[PDB]
Design an enzyme around this catalytic site. Structure first.
Site, mmCIF file in Angstrom:
data_model
loop_
_atom_site.group_PDB
_atom_site.id
_atom_site.type_symbol
_atom_site.label_atom_id
_atom_site.label_comp_id
_atom_site.label_asym_id
_atom_site.label_seq_id
_atom_site.Cartn_x
_atom_site.Cartn_y
_atom_site.Cartn_z
ATOM 1 N N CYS A 49 -13.645 2.690 -13.793
ATOM 2 C CA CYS A 49 -14.100 4.045 -13.534
ATOM 3 C C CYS A 49 -12.894 4.986 -13.539
ATOM 4 O O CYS A 49 -12.552 5.585 -12.517
ATOM 5 C CB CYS A 49 -14.809 4.086 -12.180
ATOM 6 S SG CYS A 49 -15.883 5.533 -11.946
ATOM 7 N N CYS A 104 -18.910 -1.732 -16.312
ATOM 8 C CA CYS A 104 -19.042 -1.534 -14.872
ATOM 9 C C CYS A 104 -20.279 -2.177 -14.255
ATOM 10 O O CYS A 104 -21.397 -1.981 -14.731
ATOM 11 C CB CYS A 104 -19.033 -0.035 -14.552
ATOM 12 S SG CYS A 104 -18.986 0.302 -12.763
ATOM 13 N N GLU A 124 0.822 -1.203 0.000
ATOM 14 C CA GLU A 124 0.000 0.000 0.000
ATOM 15 C C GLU A 124 0.857 1.256 0.000
ATOM 16 O O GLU A 124 0.567 2.212 -0.714
ATOM 17 C CB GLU A 124 -0.946 0.001 1.204
ATOM 18 C CG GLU A 124 -2.111 -0.971 1.072
ATOM 19 C CD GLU A 124 -3.055 -0.594 -0.062
ATOM 20 O OE1 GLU A 124 -3.455 0.587 -0.125
ATOM 21 O OE2 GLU A 124 -3.404 -1.473 -0.880
ATOM 22 N N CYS A 171 -25.776 3.818 -11.308
ATOM 23 C CA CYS A 171 -24.878 4.960 -11.186
ATOM 24 C C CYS A 171 -25.472 6.246 -11.758
ATOM 25 O O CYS A 171 -25.895 6.279 -12.912
ATOM 26 C CB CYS A 171 -23.560 4.643 -11.893
ATOM 27 S SG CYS A 171 -22.387 6.029 -11.953
HETATM 28 S S1 SF4 Z 1 -21.057 3.289 -14.192
HETATM 29 FE FE1 SF4 Z 1 -20.521 4.914 -12.689
HETATM 30 S S2 SF4 Z 1 -19.047 3.974 -11.342
HETATM 31 FE FE2 SF4 Z 1 -19.212 2.589 -13.119
HETATM 32 S S3 SF4 Z 1 -17.535 3.350 -14.496
HETATM 33 FE FE3 SF4 Z 1 -19.350 4.487 -15.040
HETATM 34 S S4 SF4 Z 1 -19.145 6.410 -13.786
HETATM 35 FE FE4 SF4 Z 1 -17.748 4.896 -12.815
#
Ligand code: SF4
EC number: 3.2.2.31
Length: 225
Positions: free
Chosen positions: A192, A202, A37, A208
């Site tokens: 993202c 995603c 990390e 989202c």
């Molecule tokens: S859906 Fe939302 S969280 Fe997923 S990549 Fe797109 S902006 Fe990022």
């Protein structure tokens, strides 16, 4: 989407596309996660890998790291940049040797008390290596949460940071925390992305806000000035 759905969708995604091949993701221990990390903080993963291996070979345990001369540590760090990290790393190792009998602490307070280790890093160390129930909030997570929940304020502002910490706690489960937290960092780093996020790949795309409004550029907010 409900917080329960959030973590479930993220975990389902991780099981199918998750890639835990990195050295610090194999046979995890608090020491190994901590070391990784700190190196990954301000350095690209590709660059870090060889250094992580060299450090683990030279310093099998935190006590070996603690007993080594600071100059040797700094010499081995050459190339990673931001050497303040290396100095805090060595001090932390010495603290572990002095106050915790050479055994990296497995309690939040003791870990967070270490030099160079903050709230998020302490949570990452314990959740990833032991499955302790703690959420994280690094650049990757902030971006995913800010976009999914439309937090447009600058994280540099206390109230905004607190808001993001609350969201992270809300979506972070106890069961599968190790996989969820690693998944969130992977999502923020590979899917993202700061620029033109790959929403179609995603697991959060269905709920989202940024994706619905094609407004990812607004989250998180940038430093005002
Ligand atoms: S859906 Fe939302 S969280 Fe997923 S990549 Fe797109 S902006 Fe990022």
């Amino acid at each position: 989407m409900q917080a329960s759905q959030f973590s479930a969708q993220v975990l389902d995604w991780y099981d199918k596309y998750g890639r835990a091949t990195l050295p610090w993701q194999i046979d995890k221990t608090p020491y190994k996660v901590w070391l990784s990390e700190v190196m990954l903080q301000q350095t690209q993963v590709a660059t870090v890998i060889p250094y992580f291996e060299r450090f683990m070979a030279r310093f099998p345990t935190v006590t070996d790291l603690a007993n080594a001369p600071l100059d040797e540590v700094l010499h081995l760090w050459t190339g990673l940049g931001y050497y303040a990290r290396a100095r805090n790393l060595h001090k932390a190792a010495q603290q572990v040797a002095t106050l915790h009998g050479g055994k990296f602490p497995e309690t939040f307070e003791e870990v967070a008390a270490l030099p160079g280790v903050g709230r998020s890093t302490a949570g990452a160390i314990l959740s990833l290596s032991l499955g302790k129930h703690f959420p994280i909030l690094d650049g990757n997570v902030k971006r995913v949460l800010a976009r999914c929940y439309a937090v447009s304020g600058w994280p540099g502002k206390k109230e905004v940071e607190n808001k993001l910490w609350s969201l992270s706690e809300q979506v972070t489960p106890a069961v599968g925390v190790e996989r969820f937290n690693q998944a969130m960092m992977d999502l923020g780093a590979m899917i993202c992305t700061r620029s033109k996020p790959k929403c179609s790949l995603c697991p959060l795309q269905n709920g989202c806000i940024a994706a619905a409004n094609n407004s990812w550029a607004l989250y998180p907010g940038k430093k005002p000035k």
